[PDB]
Amino acid sequence: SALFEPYTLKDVTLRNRIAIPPMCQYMAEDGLINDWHQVHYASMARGGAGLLVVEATAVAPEGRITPGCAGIWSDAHAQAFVPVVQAIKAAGSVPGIQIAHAGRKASANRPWEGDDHIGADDARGWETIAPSAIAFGAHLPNVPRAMTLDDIARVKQDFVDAARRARDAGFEWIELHFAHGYLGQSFFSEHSNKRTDAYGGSFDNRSRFLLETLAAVREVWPENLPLTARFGVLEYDGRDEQTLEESIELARRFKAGGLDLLSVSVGFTIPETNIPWGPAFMGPIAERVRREAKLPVTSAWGFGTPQLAEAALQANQLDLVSVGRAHLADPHWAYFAAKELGVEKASWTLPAPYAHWLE
Amino acid sequence: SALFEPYTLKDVTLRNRIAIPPMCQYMAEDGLINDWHQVHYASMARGGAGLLVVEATAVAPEGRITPGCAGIWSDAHAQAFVPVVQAIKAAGSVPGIQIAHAGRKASANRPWEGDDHIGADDARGWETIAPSAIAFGAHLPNVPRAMTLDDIARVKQDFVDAARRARDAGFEWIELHFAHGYLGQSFFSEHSNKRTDAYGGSFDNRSRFLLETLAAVREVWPENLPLTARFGVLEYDGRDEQTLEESIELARRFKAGGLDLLSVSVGFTIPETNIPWGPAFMGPIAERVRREAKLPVTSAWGFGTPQLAEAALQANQLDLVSVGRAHLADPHWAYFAAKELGVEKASWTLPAPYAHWLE
Ligand SMILES: Cc1cc2c(cc1C)N(C[C@H](O)[C@H](O)[C@H](O)COP(=O)(O)O)c1[nH]c(=O)[nH]c(=O)c1N2
Numbered sequence: 171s172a173l174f175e176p177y178t179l180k181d182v183t184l185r186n187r188i189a190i191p192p193m194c195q196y197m198a199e200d201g202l203i204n205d206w207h208q209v210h211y212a213s214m215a216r217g218g219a220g221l222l223v224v225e226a227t228a229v230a231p232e233g234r235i236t237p238g239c240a241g242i243w244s245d246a247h248a249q250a251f252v253p254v255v256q257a258i259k260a261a262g263s264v265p266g267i268q269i270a271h272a273g274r275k276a277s278a279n280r281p282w283e284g285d286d287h288i289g290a291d292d293a294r295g296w297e298t299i300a301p302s303a304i305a306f307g308a309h310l311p312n313v314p315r316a317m318t319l320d321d322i323a324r325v326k327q328d329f330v331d332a333a334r335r336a337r338d339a340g341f342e343w344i345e346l347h348f349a350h351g352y353l354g355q356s357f358f359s360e361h362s363n364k365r366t367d368a369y370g371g372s373f374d375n376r377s378r379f380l381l382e383t384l385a386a387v388r389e390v391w392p393e394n395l396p397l398t399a400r401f402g403v404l405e406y407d408g409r410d411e412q413t414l415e416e417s418i419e420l421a422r423r424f425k426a427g428g429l430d431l432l433s434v435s436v437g438f439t440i441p442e443t444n445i446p447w448g449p450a451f452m453g454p455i456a457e458r459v460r461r462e463a464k465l466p467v468t469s470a471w472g473f474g475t476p477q478l479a480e481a482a483l484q485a486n487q488l489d490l491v492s493v494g495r496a497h498l499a500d501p502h503w504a505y506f507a508a509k510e511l512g513v514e515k516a517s518w519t520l521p522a523p524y525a526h527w528l529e
Numbered sequence: 530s531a532l533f534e535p536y537t538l539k540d541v542t543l544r545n546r547i548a549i550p551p552m553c554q555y556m557a558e559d560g561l562i563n564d565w566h567q568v569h570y571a572s573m574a575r576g577g578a579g580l581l582v583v584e585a586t587a588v589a590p591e592g593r594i595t596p597g598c599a600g601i602w603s604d605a606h607a608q609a610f611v612p613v614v615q616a617i618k619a620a621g622s623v624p625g626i627q628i629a630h631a632g633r634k635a636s637a638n639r640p641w642e643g644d645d646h647i648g649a650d651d652a653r654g655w656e657t658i659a660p661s662a663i664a665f666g667a668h669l670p671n672v673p674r675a676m677t678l679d680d681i682a683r684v685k686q687d688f689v690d691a692a693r694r695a696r697d698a699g700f701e702w703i704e705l706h707f708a709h710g711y712l713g714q715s716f717f718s719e720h721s722n723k724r725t726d727a728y729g730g731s732f733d734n735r736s737r738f739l740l741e742t743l744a745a746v747r748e749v750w751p752e753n754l755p756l757t758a759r760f761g762v763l764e765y766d767g768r769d770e771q772t773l774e775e776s777i778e779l780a781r782r783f784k785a786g787g788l789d790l791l792s793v794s795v796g797f798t799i800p801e802t803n804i805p806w807g808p809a810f811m812g813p814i815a816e817r818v819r820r821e822a823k824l825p826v827t828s829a830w831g832f833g834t835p836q837l838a839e840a841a842l843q844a845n846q847l848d849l850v851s852v853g854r855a856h857l858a859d860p861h862w863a864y865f866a867a868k869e870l871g872v873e874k875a876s877w878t879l880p881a882p883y884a885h886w887l888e
Pocket residue numbers: 191192193194195225226268347349350400470471472473474492493494495496882886
């Protein structure tokens with residue numbers, strides 16, 4: 171099975187090609203994770219996935235999506251992750267983290283508590299920041315404050331500090347969240363970036379915040395540990411071929427800047443889109459990015475069937491398959507996939523106190 | 530769905546009829562549980578099951594099956610259980626524990642490390658005790674020491690101390706392990722009990738250890754929490770109708786002694802048997818115990834299919850269905866069952882950070 175071959179990138183070796191992508195739990199308090207996250211992550215790691223990327227973890231308080239998001243904007247915040255790192259490692263999986271800044275999609279309610287921007291009169295909310303003072307719209311109508319040059323430098327330094335802390339906490343894999351309509355994605359997109367200084371206009375200027383943040387993080391993040399990013403390479407906004415061509419050139423520039431792997435996604439920059447959801451629908455996009463930018467990739471959004479994961483790998487569309495929601499449903503999904511694909515001694519994808527009895 | 534109806538017994542209410550039976554993990558050290566159990570039990574509780582009975586926990590060191598078995602023979606051992614208890618409650622499941630003494634099956638290797646009696650040169654081993662100096666045979670050849678009256682008195686008091694400690698740790702449900710060929714089962718069976726004193730020979734004498742232990746425990750276990758036991762009601766040894774008739778009479782005596790519920794199983798007292806393993810094969814035996822002893826019952830051994838569990842409840846064979854190995858395979862099995870049986874808003878068998886996304 172391709173899905174259960176190991177993967178080596180820099181000095182990290184993953185025991186198979188199953189990655190758990192970052193999935194916000196909205197269960198933190200003032201950025202501090204807790205018992206909820208400890209069991210959630212340790213249980214999934216024991217399930218057998220080779221790589222577990224911890225949810226979007228805010229580099230700054232205002233960079234949270236919700237009052238429940240994890241943060242890493244202080245050393246105390248970082249120290250809370252150590253037991254998660256240790257549990258993921260004890261289960262044989264590799265611990266990663268996604269560091270993030272929600273940009274104009276910040277100050278929102280939890281998804282099951284309205285999923286919408288927090289109102290002005292609710293004290294739990296805060297002012298958001300973005301490249302330009304333009305709202306997403308729809309359920310997120312709040313207009314962000316356009317970032318100053320000092321703002322741009324401060325946030326780049328929060329990403330550096332976040333990466334410094336993740337390193338020191340023991341993570342072996344980092345992912346910069348430049349996707350899904352949050353701060354980084356909104357600098358790259360013409361939809362959201364109307365700046366007239368060095369950080370807007372041309373392709374080079376729209377690229378600048380992302381490339382400078384990459385470069386700054388690269389300085390503190392070990393060369394022997396994978397440096398990755400997630401990026402939305404198209405929006406399904408009717409501008410797909412031009413957007414894709416530009417996104418692939420920026421990925422060429424990420425590679426020149428030392429990126430080891432790109433997690434390929436959708437922009438979600440604006441609500442006025444027509445995304446063709448379906449099983450493995452990102453496969454061909456991911457493949458194009460991989461081939462044209464000459465960079466390993468993962469992706470998500472449907473691949474959560476064992477035959478779809480296996481297929482993508484064999485067609486060299488992906489190097490890792492990210493499987494999210496199926497792990498929410500079953501934290502032992504990797505074991506289910508091993509059984510489905512006829513892996514030998516499939517029950518031993520799980521630790522012994524389980525594997526002995528299931529074989 | 531019958532499976533997702535609540536159940537009330539004494540002051541305890543279970544949110545559904547899915548019970549997780551005791552399943553040994555063999556991961557403790559000197560009886561002390563650790564991070565393995567914390568995650569294991571908390572994850573399964575979050576999966577939705579109404580009741581989670583913690584694995585066989587030894588009332589005394591020599592009462593462990595293996596060097597990896599959990600213990601409750603001291604107050605520090607009992608304090609280790611408190612985070613487990615609190616984690617199970619936090620997920621909305623009810624915490625139970627099974628207290629146990631392995632009798633002549635003690636001093637054995639972990640199942641995946643030979644599963645056989647420890648050899649006398651191995652420094653890990655200990656002397657075992659039983660009603661009579663007779664070995665199980667097969668892979669468990671060690672001949673146990675015959676207990677004296679002073680031994681019987683001591684072991685009874687250890688069950689009492691264990692129950693007292695379980696109460697204080699916050700368990701809300703206790704199960705006396707009188708099944709599967711361990712100490713209690715071996716007092717009842719004529720195969721293993723050749724005593725000529727008050728604890729051997731007649732039905733009354735063979736029953737005595739079990740009844741006195743129950744009575745002793747009933748004195749310290751709160752009247753308002755379920756007091757239960759697991760008992761092997763037949764052996765498949767060619768003596769089934771007489772053995773089952775006797776077992777049912779003892780169930781009546783358990784009820785007269787305050788037992789609230791009986792977990793109906795097989796004896797496993799000797800290796801020379803022909804157990805007819807199959808899906809739901811205990812259903813009819815369980816039903817007979819329930820009807821004839823007029824006592825609530827659970828059972829296990831192939832109910833781990835949503836339709837099989839539902840059927841047994843609808844036929845009134847059982848009050849709770851114990852689903853073990855299916856929970857090792859998928860700690861969210863109760864969610865899988867609620868989906869299969871078409872339960873309304875099945876994803877909310879799980880907590881919000883999962884249920885929201887899976888509906
Ligand atoms: C609960 C939850 C939470 C989030 C997400 C999704 C879900 C379900 N996803 C997107 C996720 O990583 C993945 O791309 C999608 O879930 C699609 O993959 P599946 O179809 O679920 O296998 C995600 N994306 C990301 O980059 N960072 C994150 O923190 C989150 N958080």
